[PDB]
A and B are shown apart, each in its own frame.
Chain A
Amino acid sequence: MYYGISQFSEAYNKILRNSSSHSSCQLVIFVSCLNIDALCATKMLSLLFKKQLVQSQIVPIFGYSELRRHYSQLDDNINSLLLVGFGGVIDLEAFLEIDPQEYVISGEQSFRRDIYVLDAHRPWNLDNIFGSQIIQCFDDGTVDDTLGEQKEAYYKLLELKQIHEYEGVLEEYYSQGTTVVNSISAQIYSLLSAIGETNLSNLWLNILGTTSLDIAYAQVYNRLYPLLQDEVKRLTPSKTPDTLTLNIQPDYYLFLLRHSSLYDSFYYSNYVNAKLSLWNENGKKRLHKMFARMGIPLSTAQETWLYMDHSIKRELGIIFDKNLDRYGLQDIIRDGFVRTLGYRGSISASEFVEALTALLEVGNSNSAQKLTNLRKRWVSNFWLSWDALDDRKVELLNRGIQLAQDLQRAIFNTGVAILEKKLIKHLRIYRLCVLQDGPDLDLYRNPLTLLRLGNWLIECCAESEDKQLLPMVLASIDENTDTYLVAGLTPRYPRGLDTIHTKKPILNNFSMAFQQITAETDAKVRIDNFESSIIEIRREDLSPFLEKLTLSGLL
């Protein structure tokens, strides 16, 4: 079943009722380990259940591999389980091996455990929405507004001459690619507003989770932005070294401008590298032609943001408004949200998102159970990002700014070498990029960095029109273990990506194909991120793997 937007407080009361039936902890929140919207949403929830004494418990969940294991170990005392950031697209009852009668132990149908799903991913799995009482999803209004034809085709659950092509209806429905259509933190903030629990810390966590959607679903962030600015505009209390004040200021779409330099904010932007192609040499000259036309000398633009003259910083606004659109970089001009704690330096929400992403990926900076070394590194990367959400832990936020700058620079140098060597070759249904060693930071033994290099290659490369709609497969050989690390990327929708008249790729469920091929490949290390991505195979297993991939959906 599902709850409408109106029923959010009703479902919240159901959780607050069942979890406060005993001093013992009977509330568990399963957090999607590596996405900021889920990270901040559970922080809002825990703080809600902490500002109000409900014993909660946070469990980072990396993938459906970890979901099945962690659920099978839930002590029976837990009558309320929250899945934040995942689970909506799969049949949770079937996957969790749940018999609804084993849980039947007033009104409706009451179970010993309620499993709520707070997930902004789409499409909804129709069993979670229409064929389950114990699975209780927090809906966006997506079901009431869009799923009419699929609900009818689903409720043709006849079992018993004449024929029924509702199968074709559900086939087209489940052949859509996975997308994100909302912010979980924005939904949590709507619950806090309905129950009157909106402090400035909750709004900041709401802004953080929503801002983290701008990197891959920009038009979702653009849709939720007016209500964010409406809240910030509303709260107008006009001290403490802990006073939290939010303010709407220009927050330009450059890479950590206020924490590096005006030159490096451009040079390391994936947006301006897509519009200028800085990886070659003709492109960098045009960045210098841009600064020259701006009247900003290079030596001043390359000064650190602190040392740079304020005279330029106060003219940066108007300078951007007259020079940028000539180079097709108008999207740099952007208003954002800025948080200040007492009288320390201010931090941006987009800058905050950059630090949380670096902490989540490289926070701590026998291939059997060597995955455990990855598991323990990932959950501690989660708790570092969880601790960074404490306002008093400014040291963690500032190290993430440094990791993000070191991470992006390494990604830039590797991708520039890949683009200038023309390594990405082009097959019918996917693009292939085979890396050898890679002399920069870590051979991509750290698997999350390989995904970021792929997204970098997808973003900053030109590759015409007919072609960036294609997924990208990346293989990185580890000459020490003689193994490949293989990852599959579907192109997403960042801020600077033109969206008009363009069409979704006809084969938008490539991650489904990539998952099916890995499930029949001898993986020496099998990594399960929620959208099916990374495995480690022997060198001689890569050739059959890529060959099978070209046959996806044929027979």
Chain B
Amino acid sequence: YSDPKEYIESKYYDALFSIHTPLAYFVKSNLVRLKNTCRTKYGSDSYKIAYQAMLQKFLLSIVQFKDRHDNRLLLEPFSSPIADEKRKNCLTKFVIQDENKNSSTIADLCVVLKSREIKLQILLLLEIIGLNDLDWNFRDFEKKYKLKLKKRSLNLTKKGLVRLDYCEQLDLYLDRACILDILLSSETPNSNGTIQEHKKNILDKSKEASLVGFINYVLIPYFNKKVPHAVEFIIQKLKGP
């Protein structure tokens, strides 16, 4: 409530670390209050320039996301006391106040937070895609991407020789989300530990924590009318051909 900068910082890390609360709360109330706030301080127009500029500062590049989740570094202290407190409190609830922990508990807490922040970053991306009127890109995304595909193939060659793009970012996050789901299913393991029960919701299509539940409970309700092509694009990728 102090500074909208530190308000959305409070509400982002609240949405990330509070595993029980649904991500629909972050979309329906947190992001709306922030959009209402930039409205007042910047007028009825030319406030999207400030509303997106603030969301952009919480948008993680796919490279930043991996360095952030590698080696369980997400459980390591954050610089800002605002973000660091939400980290410690979730630790108190899931790793410290759960008795007869297994060594799987820390790993289970990170994969839960990793799959959750993927969806969280997809939300920021979908919001930025709407503010910049980029939803048209998701009609024949496979057919338009062939130009950048040629750039990537040429770049692979550039290393063994001489001897910004929010839609690609959304595609990369969806790819990363699918790898998490495929390996969590193939791991096999043929309430509970409260951190465990949350890990099981990642594959339960009844829950918002799953991809199907994230679509039906967050994406379709709150994003289908603002970014309909991207929602259909996300569906076609997660459902699969």
Which residues of A are at the interface with B, using a C-beta cutoff of 8 A? 91, 94, 167, 170-172, 174-175, 422, 425-429, 432, 434, 436, 463-464, 466-467, 477, 506-509, 512-513, 516, 542-544, 546-547, 550-555
Contacts and interface: CB of A to CB of B under 8 A. Distances in A.
Contact of B155 (A94, A543, A553): A553
A426 B149 contact: no
Contact of B188 (A429, A432, A436): A436
Contacts of B43: none
A544 B161 contact: no
A334 to B, nearest CB: 32
B172 A550 contact: yes
A426 B240 contact: yes
B161 A550 contact: no
Contacts of A546: 179, 183
Interface string B144-179: 011001111111111111110000000110011011
A464 B241 contact: yes
B171 A428 contact: yes
A174 B241 contact: no
Nearest to A463: B241
A94 B152 contact: no
B183 A94 contact: no
Given A167-B161, A550-B172, A466 B142 contact: yes
A168 B144 CA distance: 23
Nearest to B155: A553
Contacts, number: 94
Given A425-B240, A555-B63, A507 B161 contact: no
Contacts of B178: 425, 427, 432
A34 to B, nearest CB: 24
A507 B175 contact: no
B55 to A, nearest CB: 23
Q: Which of B70, B163, B183 has the most CB of A within 10 A?
A: B183
Given A463-B241, A516-B159, A544-B70, A434 B186 contact: yes
Contacts of A542: 183
Contacts of A477: 186
Interface residues of B, number: 36
B161 A174 contact: yes
A285 B166 CA distance: 48
B97 to A, nearest CB: 27
A550 B175 contact: yes
A553 B179 contact: no
B146 A553 contact: no
B85 to A, nearest CB: 29
Contacts of A507: 149-150, 152-153
B175 A512 contact: no
A135 to B, nearest CB: 15
Contacts of B75: none
Top 7 closest pairs, chain A to chain B, by CB: A553-B152, A553-B155, A507-B153, A506-B149, A434-B186, A175-B157, A550-B175
Nearest to A172: B154
Contact of B176 (A426, A547, A554): A547
B239 to A, nearest CB: 10
Contacts of A509: 153, 156-157
Given A427-B178, A547-B176, A512 B157 contact: yes
Contacts of A550: 172, 175-176, 179
Contacts of A434: 182-183, 186
Contacts of B93: none
B154 A171 contact: yes
A512 B156 CA distance: 7
Contact of A428 (B151, B175, B182, B241): B175
B62 interface: yes
B183 A516 contact: no
A19 to B, nearest CB: 33
Contact of A547 (B154, B159, B179): B179
B17 to A, nearest CB: 22
A379 B91 CA distance: 55
Contacts of A175: 153-154, 156-157
A5 to B, nearest CB: 29
A170 B240 CA distance: 37
A167 B162 contact: yes
A62 B183 CA distance: 31
A94 B180 CA distance: 40
Contact of A432 (B70, B156, B157, B179): B179
B235 to A, nearest CB: 14
A543 B241 contact: no
Interface string B53-72: 00000000011001000100
20 contacts: A91-B163, A174-B157, A175-B156, A428-B171, A432-B179, A434-B186, A436-B186, A466-B142, A467-B241, A477-B186, A507-B153, A509-B153, A509-B156, A512-B156, A516-B156, A543-B180, A544-B66, A546-B183, A551-B62, A553-B153
A170 B161 contact: yes
A506 B179 contact: no
A171 B152 contact: no
Contacts of B240: 422, 425-426
B182 A513 contact: no
A171 B157 contact: yes
B182 A425 contact: yes
A502 to B, nearest CB: 14
Contacts of A422: 240
A463 B240 CA distance: 10
A553 B149 CA distance: 9
Nearest to B153: A507
Nearest to B111: A543
